[PDB]
Amino acid sequence: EFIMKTRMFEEEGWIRKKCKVCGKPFWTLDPDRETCGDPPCDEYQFIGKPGIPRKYTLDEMREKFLRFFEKHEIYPHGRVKRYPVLPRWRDDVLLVGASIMDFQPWVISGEADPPANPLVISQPSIRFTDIDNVGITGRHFTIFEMMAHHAFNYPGKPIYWMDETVELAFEFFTKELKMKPEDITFKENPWAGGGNAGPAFEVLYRGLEVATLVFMQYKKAPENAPQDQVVVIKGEKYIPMETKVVDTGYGLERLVWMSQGTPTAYDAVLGYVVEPLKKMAGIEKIDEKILMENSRLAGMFDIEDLGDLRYLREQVAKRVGITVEELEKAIRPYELIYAIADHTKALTFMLADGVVPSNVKAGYLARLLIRKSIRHLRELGLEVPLSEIVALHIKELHKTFPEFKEMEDIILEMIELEEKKYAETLRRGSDLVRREIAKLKKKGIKEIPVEKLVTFYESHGLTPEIVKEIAEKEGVKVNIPDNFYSMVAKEAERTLVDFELLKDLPDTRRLYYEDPFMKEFDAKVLRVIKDWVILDATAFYPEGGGQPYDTGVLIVNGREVKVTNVQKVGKVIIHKVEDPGAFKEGMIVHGKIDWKRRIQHMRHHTGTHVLMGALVRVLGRHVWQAGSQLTTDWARLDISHYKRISEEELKEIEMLANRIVMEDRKVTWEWLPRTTAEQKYGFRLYQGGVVPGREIRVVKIEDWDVQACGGTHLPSTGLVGPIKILRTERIQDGVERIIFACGE
Ligand SMILES: [Zn+2]
Secondary structure (H helix, E strand, C coil): CCCCCCHHHHHHCCCEEEECCCEEEEEECCCCCCCCCCCCCCCCCCCCCCCCCCCCCCHHHHHHHHHHHCCCCCCEEEEEECCCCCCCCCCCCCCCCCCCCCCCHHHCCCCCCCCCCEEEEEEEEEEECCHHHHCCCCCCCCEEEEEEEEEEEEECCCCCCHHHHHHHHHHHHHHHHCCCHHEEEEEECCEEEEEEECCEEEECCCCEEEEEEEEEEEEECCCCCCCCCEECCCCCCEEEEEEEEEEEEEEHHHHHHHCCCCCCHHHHHCHHHHHHHHHHHHHCCCCCCHHHHHHHHHCCCCCCCCCHHHHHHHHHHHHHCCCHHHHHHHHHHHHHHHHHHHHHHHHHHHHHHHCCCCHHHHHHHHHHHHHHHHHHHHHCCCCCHHHHHHHHHHHCCCCCCHHHHHHHHHHHHHHHHHHHHHHHHHHHHHHHHHHHHHHHHHCCCCCCCCCHHHHHHHCCCCHHHHHHHHCCCCCCCCCCCCHHHHHHHHHHHHHHHHCCCCCCEEEEEEEHCCCCCCCEEEEEEEEECEEEECCCCECCCEECCCCCCCEEEEEECCCEEEEEEEEECCCEEEEECCHHHHHCCEEEEEEEEEEHHHHHCCCHHHHHHHHHHHHHHHCCCCCCEEEEEEEECEEEEEECCCCCCCCCHHHHHHHHHHHHHHHHCCEEEEEEEEHHHHHHHHHHHHCCCCCCCCCCEEECCCCCCCEECCCCCCEEEHHCCEEEEEEEEEEECEEEEEEECCCC
16 A cells, blocks of 8 residues: 655665565565565574674664764754653653654644754653563563654655665664665554554564654544545554654664674663672573573564463473473573563653652553562562662663763652552552452452452552462462553543634734733623623633633723633633623723732742742752642642652742742743743743643743743742742642742
8 A cells, every 4th residue: 555665675676575474565685585574474583693793882872873863974963862751742642652752743743843854863762561571572671762863844845755764774774783784674564653653664684673664644533534544553543644754763772682692682781780680689590592592482472462471481491492380480580680670770761750659640650660670579589679779770871861860869769768668558458458359259259350450459559469379368360461560551541611603703812911910901892602701802811820810890881890700712712791781792891800819810820930940949850740729819839749848848948939039030921932942941841731832932930940831920029929838738649739828
């Protein structure tokens, strides 16, 4: 269905074939190749025999890639600093799972400018879909770096496309990495990621997929899309888009593994943790071919799709010449070490980038990794705090990722607190599940359902091997599924008046953006739906961003009519009035805002921002808004935070906030293109979540705080008056609330 002929293929003698095993199309220079180069059609050929002629570390390979694209003489790329693994710019995914997620939805739609075009990036990426594979297959990670060159071809502005992408890829592999040209295949296989899809190549070499080259030209299909949708790859329905995006992904770890030829990718990437762990646990060397064969055979073996690891192990057992029991005995301590090594690295990135362990979203996933790793350490017989293993990653990685050093105290404390609380969680959970298990076998069935085992973790915090040893006392039957953690992880993703009657009306001019001190204005009545009056312009603030609506009056024919509620539907502002019959279309009215109410809201709104700057400085840079609500008399600010705020801390925060009020710092706002705002201020802009639009309204307190914000603010901090913190309290794991009052 997709034509993927290129200039390079045509000019350089590449032959399109159909793989004799999987039937997929692939391109090769090798006249005797009949298979695509992808397991199980081909096998890993580089283990014990590096396919790249010189060895590379992570730092070397990453820089090799970045520099190649950056300094390219024909297609120079702008080097872009990696994004946090927490996608502050979007509300639809939990974690960055690919480099392209940095540029969705805003860059791809054309709502944001690309940071550079074309660009090159090495993006730390996290995926939980293969978590049970980690340590088991020799190749799977939860945390990895996807190196990428991206080009955003908006209509009318071509950058580069399919021809140049295959050439750049081939040039990097053959000229920079000295890989054998005829061993490289381009397998046609459509791809998708984070809302978009298109035709793609898998670039295969010595049995390993070393890159994916995706030509994104489709977007997630809207509900009830007509005749021509295209079904691709996982997600089904898509429709064409005008913008064509080059979406590449080169696995840093895989390329390093290709250069090392070690039994597992973990030995090539995580030796600095794997080897101390071996030594600490006193794990003796085992037969090297056990690891090698397992990795090789695992190339052909998925487990997250079918529960057949048992057969992978029967295969590697026969190959090695031992039984499955003695195989399990030998390899198990290594699987445990590999998982610990990987999980502690994932956590280093996650917590450094602002993930707070909790029972929700990405915090839920961090907590999952922490608990799994602690349980792995116990099975190894290793009595070491997890924070000590996390510390080994900070030590190794902080020179490339300075943020790890800067956040180290907080990262290690978060790990320590999670561990020390988990011991408590495990006592209470063990009894509650013992009672439930005893009650289930008392009257009903003595079998543990897979869903109840999932419920056991995410309700009582206990891992399935703990459940089974309590259960096999009375009321037996374990059956821990091979994909237990993959299923537990997927749990983290668990999810005024009318319209079309105001689609025809133009945008309400927002006079409150023109002057926050405007309290009176004249305007024309455009529409009266029920008791909602729509004006062409208004100084009435519509409820949003934690700030309640303005109230006041509209004066019509001398008569005063109360405005009791103000909302926004799309871009049209609606005013609730006590006497709608008084208002007719075309009528010009005088508006009067309840000023006491407005100014009290403004004091708490700007005061919230003053407080935010104080919170970040006292508590740490993981502090981020989880929620906000203002009233006339008080405000609340909810923040992601990992412990109770002590009374002394509260006073430190209060002193700092009031110091800034006393300094009377300027508070300013302006509209900026979103990528321009992001590159200048960072992702801290997105406190209240992510705001749509080509341009975002940025509210800045000089040298203190900056947020994308649509509220009414005071022009200086002195006008807030005293800030008095009344209360701190926990809302849930990972969320602390501060209640405060602003003004004399
Ligand atoms: Zn094939």
